[PDB]
């Protein structure tokens, strides 16, 4: 589970 | 594009309100009291994250109080704060405007784990070292974070700069004044918190840091479980059954319970064979039952696992300079002021 909606690794 | 202005107070410096303009707002996550926003400050173009917390009429907000006092290269910076209405009718919300950092240790760790690859050891060293610096700094004020986990370790992946964030659970611990036991997130809780202790110390953060180190070495959390009893079984499978003396140091109300009887798993068998031995040795001095037997943050920074960081020629694998590693202050060094002879190497003096 993630802090942010978006990531360069998503 | 829409520009919003608000009267806000700088996070650091003069207690003097200013007009602050920002634009390009967008939702980037969710919080307990409303979604978290990214925005761009009009005056500098810098990106910020704005989060909302509930203002209590009875006492000053502890997170704001703590974040106005902190100034450290491995802690997220409070740029501004201001109050507003919010998601719930009639409530007043404190808005914290923080410097925006685009990634986390958790994202980088899951990226490697999904690829069935191990995070390169140089990054494990850089990230853990910066985490221990941030802990040395806050612990030197008596402040325990109480919620260390990979999602609270912001990361700029290109520069390898790490910043600790989310001080919503943080507290100045005072010996003899009880603390709630129900802080710290699943997988990262020290065993004295699993046992419900109200008399714990800042060493709960070092246990959690040990859990983060182990997770970066293993590619998955070392003590998973959805209940405390499942977490404890995973702890006992590694550390072995705690002795009565160890239980008294964690929570003496628990000394006489019947715990699973398991011999410790050798630390050299916990991790994969090629795991660097100094990383295993450091982990073994962080994940200790007896809270006073855990290394302090400054002691962890001086551990031989971090020796490569102190080499004059160390570079990031992408060819960049390492980030700032040796700008210790008196405050940060104060738990052991004569320490440093290790911490500030010759080329940094
Ligand atoms: O441990 C704690 O966070 C706080 C301090 C008084 C109310 N309980
Ligand atoms: Cl995350």
Q: Residues 6 or more apart from B140 whose CB is under 8 A from it? A: B331, B332, B334, B335
Q: How many domains does chain B have?
A: 2
Q: Residues 6 or more apart from B110 whose CB is under 8 A from it? A: A9
Q: Are B140 and B301 in contact (CB under 8 A)?
A: no
Q: Are residues B331 and B308 in the same domain?
A: yes
For the beta carbon of residue B15, count every other beta carbon within 10 angstroms: 7
Alpha-carbon distance of B159 to B317, in angstroms, equals 11
Is residue B228 part of an annotated ligand binding site? no
Token pair of B325 as six digits: 């590693």
Which contiguous run of DSSP H or E holds residue B285?
Answer: helix B277-286
Alpha-carbon distance of B146 to B144, in angstroms, equals 6
Q: Are B50 and B37 in contact (CB under 8 A)?
A: yes
Q: Residues 6 or more apart from B277 whose CB is under 8 A from it? A: B268
Q: Are residues B290 and B245 in the same domain?
A: yes
Q: Are residues B148 and B243 in the same domain?
A: yes
Contact A6 B111 (CB under 8 A): no
Long-range CB contacts for residues B290-293, cutoff 8 Å, separation at least 24? B290/B246, B290/B249, B290/B250, B291/B190, B291/B192, B291/B200, B291/B201, B291/B203, B291/B204, B291/B207, B291/B249, B291/B250, B292/B201, B292/B203, B292/B249
Alpha-carbon distance of B35 to B106, in angstroms, equals 20
Alpha-carbon distance of B277 to B44, in angstroms, equals 46
Alpha-carbon distance of B256 to B241, in angstroms, equals 13
Alpha-carbon distance of B153 to B151, in angstroms, equals 6
Helix axes B203-218, B277-286, angle to 10 degrees: 150
Domain closes at, from B57, B74, B100: B100
Query: What φ, ψ does residue B162 adopt, rounded to 5°?
Result: -105, 140
Contact A3 B157 (CB under 8 A): no
Q: Are B203 and B249 in contact (CB under 8 A)?
A: no
Helix axes B203-218, B105-114, angle to 10 degrees: 30
B257: closest CA among B325, B195, B190?
B195
Q: Are B52 and B93 in contact (CB under 8 A)?
A: yes
Using the Cβ of B152 and the Cβ atoms of chain A, whether some distance falls under 8 Å is answered with: yes
Chain B partners within 8 Å of A3 (Cβ): 29, 104, 106, 151-152, 154
Domain closes at, from B62, B77, B100: B100
Residue B19 within a domain:
no
Token pair of B165 as six digits: 């964030």
Alpha-carbon distance of B128 to B211, in angstroms, equals 11
Residue B11 within a domain:
no
Q: What is the Cα gyration radius of chain A? A: 6
Q: Classify the C-alpha dihedral B189-B191-B195-B201 as positive or negative.
A: negative
Cα distances (Å, whole numbers) of residue B76 to B15, B20, B68, B83, B272: 20, 19, 11, 20, 33
**Residue linked to tokens 């602050």:** B20
Helix axes B203-218, B121-140, angle to 10 degrees: 170
B192 Cα to the center of ligand 1, angstroms: 17
Distance from chain centroid for Cα B278: 22
Alpha-carbon distance of B203 to B285, in angstroms, equals 12
Q: Are residues B58 and B138 in the same domain?
A: no
Tell me the β-bridge partners of B78.
Answer: B98
Alpha-carbon distance of B82 to B267, in angstroms, equals 49
Alpha-carbon distance of B66 to B73, in angstroms, equals 16
Strand B103-104 to B171-172 pairing: unpaired
Q: Is B171 in the pocket of ligand 1 (CB under 6 A)?
A: yes
For testing the chain A interface, which of B25, B26, B29 should be mutated: the one with the most A CBs within 10 Å? B29
Deposited experimental method:
X-ray
For testing the chain B interface, which of A3, A7, A9, A10 should be mutated: the one with the most B CBs within 10 Å? A3
Q: Are B37 and B31 in contact (CB under 8 A)?
A: no
Alpha-carbon distance of B293 to B256, in angstroms, equals 22
Strand B93-99 to B78-84 pairing: antiparallel
The CATH number that applies at residue B82 is 3.30.200.20
Q: For residue B247, what are the domain limits?
A: 103-344
Question: If you write DSSP's letter for every residue of B88-132 in order, what string do you get?
Answer: STT--EEEEEEE---EEHHHHHHHHHHTT-PPPHHHHHHHHHHHH
Alpha-carbon distance of B308 to B158, in angstroms, equals 19
Q: Are residues B112 and B193 in the same domain?
A: yes
Alpha-carbon distance of B51 to B42, in angstroms, equals 19
Q: What is the resolution of this structure in A?
A: 1.7
Q: Are residues B114 and B187 in the same domain?
A: yes
Give buried/exposed letters for B301-326 (b at 16+ CB in 10 A, else e): bbbebbeebbeeeeebeeeeebbebe
Q: Are B55 and B309 in contact (CB under 8 A)?
A: no
Three-point CA angle B50, B56, B59, nearest 5°? 115
Chain A partners within 8 Å of B157 (Cβ): 8
Residue B123 within a domain:
yes
Contact B27 A6 (CB under 8 A): no
Q: Classify the C-alpha dihedral B55-B58-B62-B64 as positive or negative.
A: positive
Q: Are B23 and B1 in contact (CB under 8 A)?
A: yes
Q: Is B179 in the pocket of ligand 1 (CB under 6 A)?
A: yes
Alpha-carbon distance of B228 to B234, in angstroms, equals 10
Q: Are residues B89 and B126 in the same domain?
A: no
* Residue B179 alpha carbon, nearest atom of ligand 1: 1
Q: Are residues B189 and B308 in the same domain?
A: yes
B317: closest CA among B325, B306, B308, B326?
B308
Q: Are residues B177 and B65 in the same domain?
A: no
The CATH number that applies at residue B308 is 1.10.510.10
Burial class (CB in 10 A: 0-12, 13-18, 19+), B3: exposed
Q: Are B326 and B169 in contact (CB under 8 A)?
A: no
B82: closest CA among B43, B48, B114?
B48
CA torsion B111-B190-B281-B230 (nearest 10°) is: -70
Question: If you write DSSP's letter for every residue of B168-213 in order, what string do you get?
Answer: TT-EE--TTS---S--S-TTS--HHHHTT-SS--THHHHHHHHHHH
Token pair of B333 as six digits: 């060094």
> Would you name the residues of B annotated as active-site residues?
147
């Amino acid at each position: 589970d993630f802090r942010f909606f978006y990531s360069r690794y998503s | 594009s829409k520009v919003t202005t608000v009267v806000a107070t700088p996070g650091q410096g003069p207690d003097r309100p200013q007009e602050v303009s920002y634009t390009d707002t967008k939702v980037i996550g969710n919080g307990s009291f409303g979604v978290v926003y990214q925005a761009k400050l009009c005056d500098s173009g810098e990106l910020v994250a704005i989060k909302k917390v509930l203002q209590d009429k009875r006492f000053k907000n502890r997170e704001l109080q703590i974040m106005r006092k902190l100034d450290h290269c491995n802690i997220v910076r409070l740029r501004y704060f201001f109050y507003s209405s919010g998601e719930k009718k009639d409530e007043v919300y404190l808005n914290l405007v923080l410097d925006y950092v685009p990634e986390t240790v958790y994202r980088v760790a899951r990226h490697y784990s999904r690829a069935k690859q191990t995070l390169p050891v140089i990054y494990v060293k850089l990230y853990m070292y910066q985490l221990f610096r941030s802990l040395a700094y806050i612990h030197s004020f008596g402040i325990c974070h109480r919620d260390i986990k990979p999602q609270n370790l912001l990361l700029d992946p290109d520069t390898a700069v790490l910043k600790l964030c989310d001080f919503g659970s943080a507290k100045q611990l005072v010996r003899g004044e009880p603390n709630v036991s129900y802080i710290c997130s699943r997988y990262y809780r020290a065993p004295e918190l699993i046992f419900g202790a109200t008399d714990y110390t800042s060493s709960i953060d070092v246990w959690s840091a040990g859990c983060v180190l182990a997770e970066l070495l293993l590619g998955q959390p070392i003590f998973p479980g959805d209940s405390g009893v499942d977490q404890l079984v995973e702890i006992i499978k590694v550390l072995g059954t705690p002795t009565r003396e160890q239980i008294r140091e964690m929570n003496p109300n628990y000394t006489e319970f019947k715990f699973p009887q398991i011999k410790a798993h050798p630390w050299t068998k916990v991790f994969r064979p090629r795991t660097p031995p100094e990383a295993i040795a450091l982990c073994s001095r962080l994940l200790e039952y007896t809270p006073t037997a855990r290394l302090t943050p400054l002691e962890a920074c001086a551990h031989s696992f971090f020796d490569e960081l102190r080499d004059p020629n160390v570079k990031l694998p992408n060819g960049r300079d390492t980030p700032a590693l040796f700008n210790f202050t008196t405050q940060e060094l104060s738990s052991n002021p004569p320490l440093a002879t290790i911490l500030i190497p010759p080329h940094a003096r």
